[model samples]
Target: GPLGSARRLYVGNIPFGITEEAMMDFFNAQMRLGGLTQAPGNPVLAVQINQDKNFAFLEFRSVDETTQAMAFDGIIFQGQSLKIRRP
Candidate 1:
């Protein structure tokens, strides 16, 4: 599951009640909001989360997309500030 560098990211500060499905919506939506007009389908490939740690690992379709996603660090969702970082 480890792609070495790009194409993977660590997302932290997830709200307690949010579900994985909700994360898909938030992240996919963020891709559009982040001005990714060329992105095909969903840039997010997968979402792996740990409820106890309140963090999740996001897999993007490409390294370019992943780099753009990292720009979304500190994005606010569900009243919580999401922290995006390399996994």
Candidate 2:
């Protein structure tokens, strides 16, 4: 992991389910993942959908943002997909 940054072990608490095996790409690494659409300045880093499929878990990268992410609620239009982009 010295020269191969791709194969590097990294320097953080990797929670769980993240394997550093052979530097498997993102596709092969789904469990240790989340969405990354926000800009670099945005405090919201990643979001994980709940197993029950009703809500999501969001985390800010040691930065701004706050106690509640209520922006997700009360935004259902007609014939909207309540499935929440999930299985």
Candidate 3:
């Protein structure tokens, strides 16, 4: 019940043509920079993009990691300032 509640982030202002791999790399990099690296696996678990909406959803390994990622709100990526918020 509510398996992923609070573990997904709403990422807006995504750049066009952005691939899942690219987004993963971007977030992972941020995680690394923030010393959020997991003891075993990646912090970012999955990424879903909606080109039509110019937004995406990021699924983190846990609610804690998801909250940490929120610190990236307004971060510049490909000339766009990302909007990371609760989903």
Candidate 4:
């Protein structure tokens, strides 16, 4: 039997006012994922007021690093519980 590849993760429920730098900082301090850096261009994916911000993408320089982060989904961040999932 054949199996499909894993879907990329999508992190929701983010604060709209949250900036990329802030996001990076949060992950860096809390998860210590690695040396945090902002996207060179079009850093932000999308933002919605009065709704959960849509910004979910991890740059670990390798798939193994991403796997480590997936292990910590649903953890707390800045007093807010995160919702992480593949796809």
**lDDT by residue for model 2 (1-87), tens:** 122221211112222343333112321232123322233344344444444334444443432122222222332323232221211
Candidate 1 positional error at 48, Å: 0.7
Model 3 segments more than 4 A misplaced = 1-3, 37-40
lDDT per residue (tens digit) for residues 27-81 in model 4? 5555454432233222122322223345555444333434445755777766666
- Measured with C-alpha atoms, the lDDT of residue 4 in candidate 1 is 48
TM-score of each: 0.86, 0.30, 0.88, 0.56
Give one digit per residue, the lDDT tens place, for model 1 in 1-87. 226466889999999877888997889997887686375688887888885599998878888788888888998999999998887
lDDT of 3: 0.85
lDDT, candidates in the order shown:
0.83, 0.29, 0.85, 0.48
In the predicted model 2, the residue pairs found to clash are: none
User: Candidate 3 clashing pairs?
Assistant: none
- What value of lDDT does candidate 4 attain over all alpha carbons? 0.48
Q: How do the residues 1-87 of candidate 3 rate in per-residue lDDT, one tens digit apiece?
A: 136868899999999999999999989987888787556568988899985699999988887788778789999989999998888
In terms of lDDT, model 2 sits at 0.29
- Candidate rank order under TM-score: 3, 1, 4, 2
Best by lDDT: 3
Candidate with the larger TM-score of 1 and 2: 1
